[PDB]
Every structure is written in C-alpha cells, then in structure tokens.
Enzyme design. Sequence first.
Site, PDB file in Angstrom:
ATOM      1  N   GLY A 255       0.741  -1.219   0.000  1.00 24.11           N
ATOM      2  CA  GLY A 255       0.000   0.000   0.000  1.00 24.11           C
ATOM      3  C   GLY A 255       0.775   1.275   0.000  1.00 24.11           C
ATOM      4  O   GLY A 255       0.524   2.170  -0.780  1.00 24.11           O
ATOM      5  N   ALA A 256       1.785   1.337   0.861  1.00 26.00           N
ATOM      6  CA  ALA A 256       2.559   2.530   1.025  1.00 26.00           C
ATOM      7  C   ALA A 256       3.790   2.192   1.860  1.00 26.00           C
ATOM      8  O   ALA A 256       3.951   1.049   2.360  1.00 26.00           O
ATOM      9  CB  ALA A 256       1.708   3.635   1.595  1.00 26.00           C
ATOM     10  N   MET A 257       4.665   3.165   1.998  1.00 34.09           N
ATOM     11  CA  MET A 257       5.962   3.003   2.620  1.00 34.09           C
ATOM     12  C   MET A 257       6.444   4.251   3.258  1.00 34.09           C
ATOM     13  O   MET A 257       6.616   5.312   2.615  1.00 34.09           O
ATOM     14  CB  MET A 257       7.044   2.459   1.706  1.00 34.09           C
ATOM     15  CG  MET A 257       8.392   2.217   2.353  1.00 34.09           C
ATOM     16  SD  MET A 257       8.295   0.750   3.573  1.00 34.09           S
ATOM     17  CE  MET A 257       9.701   1.486   4.762  1.00 34.09           C
ATOM     18  N   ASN A 259       9.197   5.710   4.193  1.00 34.36           N
ATOM     19  CA  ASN A 259      10.582   6.134   4.154  1.00 34.36           C
ATOM     20  C   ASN A 259      10.687   7.572   4.664  1.00 34.36           C
ATOM     21  O   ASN A 259       9.840   8.446   4.393  1.00 34.36           O
ATOM     22  CB  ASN A 259      11.180   6.079   2.739  1.00 34.36           C
ATOM     23  CG  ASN A 259      10.697   4.951   1.921  1.00 34.36           C
ATOM     24  OD1 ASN A 259       9.887   5.128   0.941  1.00 34.36           O
ATOM     25  ND2 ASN A 259      11.193   3.785   2.228  1.00 34.36           N
ATOM     26  N   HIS A 291      -1.402   6.396   8.663  1.00 35.46           N
ATOM     27  CA  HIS A 291      -0.548   5.240   8.910  1.00 35.46           C
ATOM     28  C   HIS A 291       0.885   5.555   8.607  1.00 35.46           C
ATOM     29  O   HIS A 291       1.724   5.448   9.497  1.00 35.46           O
ATOM     30  CB  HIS A 291      -1.011   3.984   8.203  1.00 35.46           C
ATOM     31  CG  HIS A 291      -0.181   2.773   8.522  1.00 35.46           C
ATOM     32  ND1 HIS A 291      -0.610   1.821   9.404  1.00 35.46           N
ATOM     33  CD2 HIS A 291       1.023   2.347   8.073  1.00 35.46           C
ATOM     34  CE1 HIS A 291       0.292   0.859   9.494  1.00 35.46           C
ATOM     35  NE2 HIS A 291       1.259   1.135   8.653  1.00 35.46           N
ATOM     36  N   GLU A 292       1.218   5.998   7.395  1.00 36.98           N
ATOM     37  CA  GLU A 292       2.617   6.196   7.046  1.00 36.98           C
ATOM     38  C   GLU A 292       3.275   7.366   7.830  1.00 36.98           C
ATOM     39  O   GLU A 292       4.438   7.325   8.241  1.00 36.98           O
ATOM     40  CB  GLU A 292       2.737   6.536   5.568  1.00 36.98           C
ATOM     41  CG  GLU A 292       2.422   5.405   4.614  1.00 36.98           C
ATOM     42  CD  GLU A 292       2.664   3.985   5.078  1.00 36.98           C
ATOM     43  OE1 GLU A 292       3.772   3.508   5.440  1.00 36.98           O
ATOM     44  OE2 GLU A 292       1.693   3.275   4.926  1.00 36.98           O
ATOM     45  N   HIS A 295       4.184   6.349  11.325  1.00 36.80           N
ATOM     46  CA  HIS A 295       5.454   5.658  11.379  1.00 36.80           C
ATOM     47  C   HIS A 295       6.610   6.523  11.634  1.00 36.80           C
ATOM     48  O   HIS A 295       7.690   6.037  12.070  1.00 36.80           O
ATOM     49  CB  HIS A 295       5.715   4.884  10.078  1.00 36.80           C
ATOM     50  CG  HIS A 295       5.153   3.512  10.027  1.00 36.80           C
ATOM     51  ND1 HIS A 295       5.400   2.561  10.987  1.00 36.80           N
ATOM     52  CD2 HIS A 295       4.483   2.868   9.015  1.00 36.80           C
ATOM     53  CE1 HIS A 295       4.863   1.415  10.615  1.00 36.80           C
ATOM     54  NE2 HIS A 295       4.291   1.583   9.430  1.00 36.80           N
ATOM     55  N   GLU A 314       4.351  -2.267  13.267  1.00 33.27           N
ATOM     56  CA  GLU A 314       3.133  -2.360  12.465  1.00 33.27           C
ATOM     57  C   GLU A 314       1.886  -2.469  13.313  1.00 33.27           C
ATOM     58  O   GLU A 314       0.880  -1.772  13.055  1.00 33.27           O
ATOM     59  CB  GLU A 314       3.212  -3.457  11.428  1.00 33.27           C
ATOM     60  CG  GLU A 314       4.335  -3.237  10.424  1.00 33.27           C
ATOM     61  CD  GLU A 314       4.208  -1.932   9.595  1.00 33.27           C
ATOM     62  OE1 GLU A 314       3.104  -1.317   9.635  1.00 33.27           O
ATOM     63  OE2 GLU A 314       5.208  -1.567   8.882  1.00 33.27           O
TER      64      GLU A 314
HETATM   65  N1  2X0 Z   1       5.919  -0.699   6.180  1.00 35.83           N
HETATM   66  C1  2X0 Z   1       4.914  -0.702   5.027  1.00 35.83           C
HETATM   67  C2  2X0 Z   1       4.797  -2.023   4.342  1.00 35.83           C
HETATM   68  C3  2X0 Z   1       6.172  -2.192   3.768  1.00 35.83           C
HETATM   69  C4  2X0 Z   1       6.269  -2.914   2.593  1.00 35.83           C
HETATM   70  C5  2X0 Z   1       5.948  -2.316   1.372  1.00 35.83           C
HETATM   71  C6  2X0 Z   1       6.092  -3.049   0.180  1.00 35.83           C
HETATM   72  C7  2X0 Z   1       6.617  -4.359   0.213  1.00 35.83           C
HETATM   73  C8  2X0 Z   1       6.981  -4.953   1.458  1.00 35.83           C
HETATM   74  C9  2X0 Z   1       6.794  -4.230   2.639  1.00 35.83           C
HETATM   75  P1  2X0 Z   1       3.280  -0.210   5.705  1.00 35.83           P
HETATM   76  O1  2X0 Z   1       2.966  -1.279   6.518  1.00 35.83           O
HETATM   77  O2  2X0 Z   1       3.545   1.120   6.288  1.00 35.83           O
HETATM   78  O3  2X0 Z   1       2.393  -0.201   4.568  1.00 35.83           O
HETATM   79 ZN    ZN Z   2       3.152   0.186   8.328  1.00 30.31          ZN
END
Ligand code: 2X0
Ligand code: ZN
Length: 865
Positions: A255-257, A259, A291-292, A295, A314
């Site tokens: 979904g998202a990341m 960083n 959510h992001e 983090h 998570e």
């Molecule tokens: N930490 C993220 C998931 C990470 C991820 C993304 C793509 C592939 C594997 C893991 P989120 O849980 O904030 O969405």
């Molecule tokens: Zn997450």
Amino acid sequence: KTVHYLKDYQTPAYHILKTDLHFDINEPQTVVKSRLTVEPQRVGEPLVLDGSAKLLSVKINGAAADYVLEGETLTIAGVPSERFTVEVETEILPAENKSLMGLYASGGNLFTQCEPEGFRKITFYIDRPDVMSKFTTTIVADKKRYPVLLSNGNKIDGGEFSDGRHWVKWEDPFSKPSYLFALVAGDLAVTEDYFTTMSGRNVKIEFYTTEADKPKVGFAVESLKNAMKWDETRFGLEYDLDIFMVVAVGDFNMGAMENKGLNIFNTKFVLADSRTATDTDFEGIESVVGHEYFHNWTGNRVTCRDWFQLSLKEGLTVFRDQEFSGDRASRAVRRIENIRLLRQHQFPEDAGPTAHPVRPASYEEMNNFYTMTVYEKGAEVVRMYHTLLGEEGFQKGMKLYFQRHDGQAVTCDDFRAAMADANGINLDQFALWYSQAGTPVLEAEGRLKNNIFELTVKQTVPPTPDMTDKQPMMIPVKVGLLNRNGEAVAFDYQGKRATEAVLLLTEAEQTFLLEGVTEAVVPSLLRGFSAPVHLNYPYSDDDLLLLLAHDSDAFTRWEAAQTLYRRAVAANLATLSDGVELPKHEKLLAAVEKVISDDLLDNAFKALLLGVPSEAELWDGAENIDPLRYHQAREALLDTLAVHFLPKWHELNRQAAKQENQSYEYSPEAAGWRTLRNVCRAFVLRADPAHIETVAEKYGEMAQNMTHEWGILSAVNGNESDTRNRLLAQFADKFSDDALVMDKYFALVGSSRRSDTLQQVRTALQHPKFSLENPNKARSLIGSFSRNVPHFHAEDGSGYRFIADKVIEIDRFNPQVAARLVQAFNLCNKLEPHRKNLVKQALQRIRAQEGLSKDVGEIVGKILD
Ligand SMILES: N[C@@H](CCc1ccccc1)P(=O)(O)O
Ligand SMILES: [Zn+2]
C-alpha cells in the site's frame, strides 16, 4: 535451505556510521557508488556485506579490496581494527526489475522499495535494521528526462552540467536503517502545501504524481495535515524535518511506505475524486496517509531490532491509524469494520497452516510475514494495553517508550516493559500475546444465584504448527448485564458499583462474582471486542434478539446479529443436505424487520447489522469442507432476505437517497447513507434481477459518483443478464484512462458468481489495460477470482488449476505477489477429499517448478508438508 531464528540473534560485528551514496542514472543502466564509514564492534571479524546487484568494484580505504562474493554476500577478511571506509560500485538495470523491490522503473520514472531487504538489491551493505547510519545521497541524471530527483531528508546542494545533466544532494540527518532509504527520479508534477507544527515551525508538504493524476491528490494532502495535527493533540508527537514528501506510484507491491521524509504510496492510497473513487477508497486514503505519517515516530524514530519485531512498528502504527480514523468520525462503525476484517482474514490465518505468533520465532522469507496476524492482531494486542491501562496510562507508556528508546532499534519486549514500568504494573503474562499463535477460545457459563451473577470462564488456545504448548493468557473481558426489557443493570465488582466492568481472565478457569444484582439478567460479553478471542456462551435466540434490540455496545449488538445469521446458515445447511424445504427463520426475519424499520439506528451501523458473515467465517472450525455447500446455504439465506423484504429494500433505498440529498462529495455523513443504499441495491437485484434494465435506462442519472456506480455494478455483477455484460463494457470504456477504475472493472470480472466467470477472466487477461506485471491489476483480476468461492472451488478443479498456473507465471517475475496468491490454497487440509486431492496436485505442480522462489516455496511447504 536457510531458516532465520529469533533465538540466534546477535548484535552486528560492524556498525555503519555514515553512508554516502552517488547515483549516476543513464540509459539503460544506473551506476551506484557508496562510501561507507564503518566502525568495528567486534574487531577482527570478517566484514560481511549483503548484496545482489552487479558488482563492479570494492575498495577498503581507497585500495582494491581482497574479497570473495558467494551467492548474495560479499566478505572481506582483512579489515582494519578501527574506523575504515568501504567503497562499492554496483550497476543496476531498473527497467528489467519487475519484482518492484530495490530500484525499479514505473511509468518511465524510477522508484525504490527497500523494506525489508530491498536495499541490498541496490548496493552491498549491512542490510539489517539494527544497523543505523546517517545517509547523504547524490543523484545525477538527464534533466529533461528526470527533472525531479529526490531522496530522504534535506536538499543541501545541486547544480547543472553542460551536457544536459543535473544533480542534487540530499542529507538526512537522522540515523536510520537501510530499509528506510528511498530515491525517486522522474518527470513528476508537484502539489505543495504546508503544516505549522505546535512549536511554530512550518513543514513544507510536497505530493508528487503524474501530471494527469495531480487533480486527484487533494484529499490525501488534507488527510496528511489532519494526521499531523492529530499526532500532536493525541500523542504529543511533532514532526522533525521542515519537508515531508509523498510520491505516488502505480506499480507497487503493497500500500505505502514510510521512508523518512519521502513516503512512497500506491496510487490507490493517494488518488481520489468523487467521480472515480468510492467513499471506502477515501477512507482508505485517510487511514493509509495517517498510517505512514504515524510511522515517523512508531518505526522511524524508534525502529525494529530485527524483523521478528515487525509487529512492534506495524501493530502499533495500525492501532494509531485506527484511533486516528475513529477520532475523525464514526468511531463505533469503524471499530466494527476492523473487527470484521480481523475475523474474516486473520482468524482463518491463525486456524490454518501458515499460522504464526505476532512475533514469529523463525522465518525463511521475511516478505511472507507482512500479514494480518502481525498487523491486525498486532493492533488488537496494542489495544489491549489501552483497555487494561486507560488512555492516560497508555500515554504514560508511550512517553516512557520514546524517552528510553528514541534513536534505537528495539523489541516487542521493550514496548511491553515501557507500558508496565510507566504504570507500575506487572505485564509478564502479557508477553504470551507475542509468542503464542492461535485464536483463544473462551468457554463461558453464567448463573444468577442469590443476588450474585456468577460468570465462569475457561480459556484454551489450540496447538499451531510451530507450537503445541499454549499457557493461559491475560485476557480482558468487558461485560454488562441486561434485564428482561433490555435496560442496563448495575452490579458490584470489585468494591465498585457500575453498569460495566473489565473482567481480567488470567487463569485456565475463573469465576467472576458480579454482586448486588436485583433482577433477572442476560450478560453482554466481550464489549468493544475487548480481546481477539472466540467466545462461546449459551444464548437463546430470544437472548440474541434482546441484545440486538437493546444492548448499548455496538460490537455486542452486531455480534448478536452475526450469531443469528450464522445459526440460520447452519440451519440451511441441514435442510439442503436432507433434501427438504428451507427453514422459515421466523425469528431472524422478525429481527431483521426491526433493524430495517428502526429510524434511530445510525445508517452505517444499520448496514453492518444487515451484512451476513462470509463463507470462511461460516466454515470456521469445520473439517471436510465442501465450499460450495456453504456458498449454497449462504446464497439461500441472502435470497430469502432479498425476496422476503423486497418492497422494504426499495423503501429504505428511497429514504437513504432522500437523506443523501445530492451531496455527492465524500463526507462521513453522506457516505453512511450511500452505504445503506448499496446494501438495499444488492438485495433488490437479488430479488428482482429484471430491475437491471430499469437501472440501465436511468444509469446516467444514478451514476452521480463512483460510490453509486460501484454499488450498482456490484449489485448486478452476478446477474445472468446480458445487460450486466454491457454495463461492465460501458464502464471500462468510460474510465479506460483511469488505472484505478480499471482495477475496479477487473475486480468485478474476477468476483462474479455468474456461471461463465472463468472464461471472462481468461479474456480479461488479454484486455489492453490489463498487465500481469502490475500488482494492482493482478490482484484485482486473479486475486478476486481466487477468492470467488464457487469458481475457485469448482468441483472439476478448473479454479485450482488456473490459480496454480498463475502462481507459477507470476513467480517468474514477482515472488511477493505469487506468494500472496498461493495462499488461496490454505484451506487444503480442511477440504473434502475430492477437492483436497486436486489442491494437493496443484501445490505439487507448483513445487515441481525449477527455480521456484523461496517466498512461494515457504508457503507451499507449510501447506503440503
Ligand atoms: N511498512 C509498510 C509495508 C512495507 C512494505 C511495502 C512493500 C513491500 C513490502 C513491505 P506499511 O505497513 O507502512 O504499509
Ligand atoms: Zn506500516
């Protein structure tokens, strides 16, 4: 075959203090050079670097290193006893990267995804999250082709060269693990805003999208600003850079990341407008943007020691995102939705062959552990701290966690210790929530003798594939009592007179004495779903009707409805199997008539009370399952409800339309009415499939936003009329240019209960807008088919064969997608013999593939072996 074990954790022999990167982007190759400043921790050990990119050179203090590269690891035996540098030069072809991990191309631009172990696909590194370093990143590229060049942190320098190339240098002052690195290079449009933090510092906000997608980004921007304010008001957490960027990407595995300072999002979680996105889509954006952002503190400022601790970030971030959404609007409805999600998806996981603790003890491929257990059960575990401790005490725990661990890579145990220590309470037993897999089952019995209600409660947790011994856990059970007319009855416990209490079950079996009770009572139990458990209490149908009509807690009222539906489905199974007429369901019908007609019920809560549990919930706990028999019984129930109340479904729809009052934009208020309206449409089109031509005639007038188009198309999607096919075709033509709406078309194709779904899915594989290599597309079409009970579980095996064929094909370029798909077969051991035999053949054929990924291999072995 390497298995990683939590028991084997050892601190790293080497630290990396500074990581300087240079990216030289060309066609087709990108050349990456690093300068790592390495600090020995255990002097004299070999330096071992993880990596899989093409390696062009390695130096240690400027001289060519003597090294060996074996597999994906590089080792240098002769390393200095004090600080030294390592320089590595790698080469990447990002347009050949279809795995979408590491550095990859998408829409002519370049993106990264590093969590969990993608950074080693870019350079050789100590690619584990307890190694935290300060990164500075230089990027050089053709200016016209790549005008936007981003990486984490602050942009500190940049310039031009005469040959058409330009460069930028980004400094991220916060030490971080490699999984939080990001880089974007592309021709992207920017949307600019800002937020001023509680200390008076402006944070420039920048969302990057394609030029065509830019008009759909505004809801996400506003949701980010709301999340920032909320972390400050609810948690006292402020942002720590003067820039926060978000980049949308159409090819993305999840979904998202998060960083640091440069979040990268799947388009589906950033883009919306009311013409193309449903109300649910908007809610999703709000959740995931929050959510992001959440983090930044729970994951970035405090990170994970090792990947076994994934739930530390998570579970807690999901809890945060849930609390954010609940504070925004509709807290009780939103809580029920979360519970429903957990029971529909996470309960089957805990009952199945891939069941694992919230903090696993071992893994082969960590990408297989981004699961409903780590996330959603993880959030439930965090929430129990809140339930045990109260909001204030929970905040004291959070404050201590950050005081102790800001800047560190830590464990689930550390979080638990912070909660325990800040509140002066012993939570040693609570650790079992991390280490013990499986759904606890509570068996409860109640008796009113004298004026004491005696609630006896036993607990048990089944063995799971990793562990047989399951000890008693710390389980909060929130309770109330209802009298014969369903009003609240006060009781005494423990020296306090109230109408509710949290009963803390800590032993195998306990009796709880609710004293001073003066009327005949029926208890309300597990209020607010106070622990992630299965609870069995002997309730009569009249007791369930009472709870549904009168209880003051949302969950327990909805659970009473759920129980009535489940009992009706069980009754249908019996008649259908005896070849007799269907039951009358006289009491259920009367309860439903009450819900329908009750004008004090919140619209969205009403819609939930009219939802029937899924087939997987219905076959929970069974052996020798024939999925089609459960499907048949459920469908018969829905057909009964559809036909019995047809005119009242039309009326409810009309009241909902009137109340929606032409407010087609997203708001929680309008969405509630639309949700109800869509439940009515589903029932109407059940009962009177001919009504589709009347819908078709007025389609344009009804199609006032995507919530309406989706709701109608969903309602008719199983109709055998040709008109269903024409409406879908017209939908695909109208929105042919919107990739996220094409995902919706593919999902309708894949999810239809019409008889000819397999062949329509096969045709859709070759649709001009379909791409197997795109995760959103693959999931929409194939993923939906795999969950389409009558088709996936067809007796001839055609569904199993199809899905196995696509696991095999997809695994050749994207093991993460394929391993998520192959879990469609998780029910294997519990199917009736004919289907079980066929699933086992499918899984052996997957296993027989040469070069099968570790990702898919791990899941097939859990199922088969
Ligand atoms: N930490 C993220 C998931 C990470 C991820 C993304 C793509 C592939 C594997 C893991 P989120 O849980 O904030 O969405
Ligand atoms: Zn997450």
